[PDB]
Amino acid sequence: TKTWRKWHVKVNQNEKRYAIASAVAASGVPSLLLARGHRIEEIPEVPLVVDD
Amino acid sequence: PGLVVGLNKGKTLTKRQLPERPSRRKGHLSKRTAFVRSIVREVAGFAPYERRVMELIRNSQDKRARKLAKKRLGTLKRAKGKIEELTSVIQSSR
Amino acid sequence: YVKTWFNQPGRKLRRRQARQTKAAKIAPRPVEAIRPAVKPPTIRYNMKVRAGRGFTLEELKAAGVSRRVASTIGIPVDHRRRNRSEESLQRNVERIKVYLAHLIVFPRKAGQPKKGDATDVSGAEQTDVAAVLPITQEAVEEAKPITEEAKNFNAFSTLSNERAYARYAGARAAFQKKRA
Amino acid sequence: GAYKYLEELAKKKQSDVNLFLSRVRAWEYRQMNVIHRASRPSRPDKARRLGYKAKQGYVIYRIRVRRGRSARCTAEERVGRYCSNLRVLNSYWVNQDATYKFFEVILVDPSHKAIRRDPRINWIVNPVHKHRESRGLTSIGKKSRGIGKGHRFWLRHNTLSLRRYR
RNA sequence: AUUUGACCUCAAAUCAGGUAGGACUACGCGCUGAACUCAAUAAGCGCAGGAAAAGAAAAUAACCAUGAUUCCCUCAGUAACGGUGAAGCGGGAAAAGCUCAAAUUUGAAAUCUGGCAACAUUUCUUUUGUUGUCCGAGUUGUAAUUUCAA
RNA sequence: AUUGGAUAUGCCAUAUAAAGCGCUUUCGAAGAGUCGAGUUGUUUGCAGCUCUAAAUGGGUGGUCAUCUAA
């Protein structure tokens, strides 16, 4: 084994921003959270917003 | 003409006269160093190939004299630089 | 022989700390010196302006600050560069003037503002040069009215002529010198 | 100043006076040792313009080396090895004959206080200047290894730089 | 005759005070250098440091000109050579400039090591200096001014 | 317990001086067996050897431009 194996991988910035935007949109959906495994049965509202 | 092509090609701006740079001066002949060069000249003499050039020039065989001078030094400009100097010494001796 | 880059984040962090240490050590003054506006020396980049090494003696003298004190107040001096056009001259001159106008000098020995100093110096603050002196690019020409003599002027017809003049310049250069 | 006259006379090496002096001096150094102390430099103008001052701490050694690598560099290395408590400042050609070239090497005693208190030569006391003549940091050393400024004057090729992201 | 004193050269001292060796070697600078382009590699030899080396143009350019060195991306696998293989420019990291010889202080060697005696000071009774006095170095040039940007 | 740099404060210093800036009615010293040439050797650069320079001269780039080596 050598140290100059390709350890890091380059991702396009637009692809990264696409994934992050989809991840936020996914977090704003109740059903995806239940599949994720979060016990949010009695969470009052999704997306959840709290004051400053 | 403010043009990209031509013998005066390039942009046109207001040209400024640059101040004189002292390192451009080197090669000038100061009066004091010229005097000192005179003193060492009269106290040291001339090299053996110079003496041969005196003999060659006093015999008036200038072609061979410049040919051997170029052979001794290596460049035609140095050979000419020698010749004018030793002829200049020649009329001074005369 | 291979050169691996596994210390790239480490080098980046070390450089940032060195900048931070430099700023802490010499905080009263900006961490970057003033730099002159200079044009690249080629046909491919002569349309841009970048930061030169330092100002010249002619620019320093025209601005009124001596080459001796210029280093002390933070104005780098380049003894090799020379100004071949006034356009660059007053350009770098006005860079220094705005620098000096925004410059405040703390009096030495803290006894009195001897000639060139600042009376009130409590407003000290470390700010970068780029904010006060933002280096710009070559001025982009704005819309201008149609010029009639230029309209009659063809264009590359001339570039063909002065080109043909340039290529055969030696041809007529011979012609005149041989017939004269 | 007489050093101008000394310098201008040193230019003309084929002069009758220079030829006679060189032969007599070269003969004298022959039955002298291969490396021997010279209490006063034979070319004071050359020594001064090379960095030698007539003060306690500067040492002049004369060395003869046979002809037929750079003789000036070899002379500096041998003198430096022969005087191990001295830093080789510079060296200069003084004489030559059919087979022997003669050089004078200027050395400085870093342990002497007249050197350690002089700000114009204090740089040589630092340990980075031990055996400059052997590492190739003298005038003839730099010229021999080709150190210069210009297009006329390796590790960047034999390596293949592999960046993190590629 | 010859005795006395100088200068020059060269010796001797278990003279006073210092310094060099050897080791480590990953990185650094040189010398040298094969064989199966290999490779200015491995081996051999010399020499340092915390970095070393390089460094303030006897530099690029042919532009509206750039402006010490080093490193990185790019130039570019291009020019070039017959597989080898750059550099200028451009973008960054970092920036800091200088010192001598060459000219008379001639109304004044103004310079400096060492010995002796005090005064001190300390990472330190362990360090580093100051003054006075003597001898010496030094006019075959030590100080101050000048380094071409002038 | 050390220090590194600044601030306030006290005491010595000796300026009969030194330095920067604008002008010249002035002069402007600048590195030699070194550059360079021929030849042999090493990967233009370097070295050995024959020979050996100049002072608006010398080096570099295609009369001009830029630098000022030893």
UniProtKB/Swiss-Prot annotation, chain A:
Protein's gene: rpl401
Domain comment (free text): The eukaryote-specific C-terminal extension harbors a nuclear import signal and delivers the ACL4-uL4/RPL4 complex to the pre-ribosome, triggering uL4 release from ACL4 and incorporation into the 60S ribosomal subunit.
Comment field (misc): There are 2 genes for uL4 in S.pombe.
Similarity field: Belongs to the universal ribosomal protein uL4 family.
Cellular location(s): Cytoplasm
Quaternary state and interactors: Component of the large ribosomal subunit (LSU). Mature yeast ribosomes consist of a small (40S) and a large (60S) subunit. The 40S small subunit contains 1 molecule of ribosomal RNA (18S rRNA) and at least 33 different proteins. The large 60S subunit contains 3 rRNA molecules (25S, 5.8S and 5S rRNA) and at least 46 different proteins. uL4 is associated with the polypeptide exit tunnel. uL4 interacts with its chaperone ACL4 and the nuclear import receptor KAP104.
Top-level division of the source organism's lineage: Eukaryota
Protein known as: Large ribosomal subunit protein uL4B
Provenance organism: Schizosaccharomyces pombe (strain 972 / ATCC 24843) (Fission yeast)
Swiss-Prot record, chain B:
Cell location: Cytoplasm
GO cellular component terms, semicolon-separated: cytosol; cytosolic large ribosomal subunit; preribosome
Molecular functions (GO terms): structural constituent of ribosome
Record-linked InterPro entries: Ribosomal_eL36 (IPR000509), Ribosomal_eL36_sf (IPR038097)
Signal peptide bounds: none
Record's keyword terms, sorted: Cytoplasm, Ribonucleoprotein, Ribosomal protein
Region feature (Disordered): 1-30
One of the GO biological process terms: cytoplasmic translation
Any one Pfam family match given in the protein's UniProt record, by short name: Ribosomal_L36e
UniProt function note: Component of the ribosome, a large ribonucleoprotein complex responsible for the synthesis of proteins in the cell. The small ribosomal subunit (SSU) binds messenger RNAs (mRNAs) and translates the encoded message by selecting cognate aminoacyl-transfer RNA (tRNA) molecules. The large subunit (LSU) contains the ribosomal catalytic site termed the peptidyl transferase center (PTC), which catalyzes the formation of peptide bonds, thereby polymerizing the amino acids delivered by tRNAs into a polypeptide chain.
Note: There are 2 genes for eL36 in S.pombe.
Recorded family membership: Belongs to the eukaryotic ribosomal protein eL36 family.
Quaternary assembly: Component of the large ribosomal subunit (LSU). Mature yeast ribosomes consist of a small (40S) and a large (60S) subunit. The 40S small subunit contains 1 molecule of ribosomal RNA (18S rRNA) and at least 33 different proteins. The large 60S subunit contains 3 rRNA molecules (25S, 5.8S and 5S rRNA) and at least 46 different proteins.
The name this protein goes by in its record: Large ribosomal subunit protein eL36B
From Swiss-Prot, chain C:
Residue numbers of Phosphoserine PTMs: 157, 160
Entry GO CC: cytosol; cytosolic large ribosomal subunit; preribosome
Pfam families, sorted: Ribosomal_L13e
Keywords, alphabetical: Cytoplasm, Phosphoprotein, Ribonucleoprotein, Ribosomal protein
Matches recorded under Gene3D superfamilies: 1.20.5.110
Biological process (GO), any one: cytoplasmic translation
Residues passing through the membrane, by range: none
Single Gene Ontology MF annotation: structural constituent of ribosome
Cellular compartments annotated: Cytoplasm
Keyword check for Cytoplasm: yes
Top-level taxon in the UniProt lineage: Eukaryota
Family: Belongs to the eukaryotic ribosomal protein eL13 family.
HAMAP family documented for this protein: Ribosomal_eL13
Biological function: Component of the ribosome, a large ribonucleoprotein complex responsible for the synthesis of proteins in the cell. The small ribosomal subunit (SSU) binds messenger RNAs (mRNAs) and translates the encoded message by selecting cognate aminoacyl-transfer RNA (tRNA) molecules. The large subunit (LSU) contains the ribosomal catalytic site termed the peptidyl transferase center (PTC), which catalyzes the formation of peptide bonds, thereby polymerizing the amino acids delivered by tRNAs into a polypeptide chain.
Subunit structure: Component of the large ribosomal subunit (LSU). Mature yeast ribosomes consist of a small (40S) and a large (60S) subunit. The 40S small subunit contains 1 molecule of ribosomal RNA (18S rRNA) and at least 33 different proteins. The large 60S subunit contains 3 rRNA molecules (25S, 5.8S and 5S rRNA) and at least 46 different proteins.
Protein known as: Large ribosomal subunit protein eL13
Name of the encoding gene: rpl13
Curated annotation (Swiss-Prot), chain D:
Residues covered by region (Disordered): 134-153
SUPFAM superfamilies: Ribosomal proteins S24e, L23 and L15e
UniProt record, GO biological process: cytoplasmic translation
SMART domains membership: Ribosomal_L15e
Top-level taxon in the UniProt lineage: Eukaryota
Protease keyword on record: no
Oligomeric form and interacting partners: Component of the large ribosomal subunit (LSU). Mature yeast ribosomes consist of a small (40S) and a large (60S) subunit. The 40S small subunit contains 1 molecule of ribosomal RNA (18S rRNA) and at least 33 different proteins. The large 60S subunit contains 3 rRNA molecules (25S, 5.8S and 5S rRNA) and at least 46 different proteins.
Biased amino acid composition, Basic residues: 142-152
Keyword Nucleus among UniProt keywords: yes
Protein name: Large ribosomal subunit protein eL15A
GO MF term (any one): RNA binding
Other noteworthy facts: There are 2 genes for eL15 in S.pombe.
GO cellular component, as recorded: cytosolic large ribosomal subunit; nucleolus; nucleus; preribosome
Family: Belongs to the eukaryotic ribosomal protein eL15 family.
InterPro entries (alphabetical): Rbsml_eL15_core_dom_sf, Ribosomal_eL15, Ribosomal_eL15_CS, Ribosomal_uL23/eL15/eS24_sf
Cell compartment(s), UniProt: Cytoplasm; Nucleus; Nucleus, Nucleolus
Principal location listed in the UniProt entry: cytoplasm
Gene3D superfamilies: Ribosomal protein l15e
Key words of the record: Cytoplasm, Nucleus, Ribonucleoprotein, Ribosomal protein
Record organism: Schizosaccharomyces pombe (strain 972 / ATCC 24843) (Fission yeast)
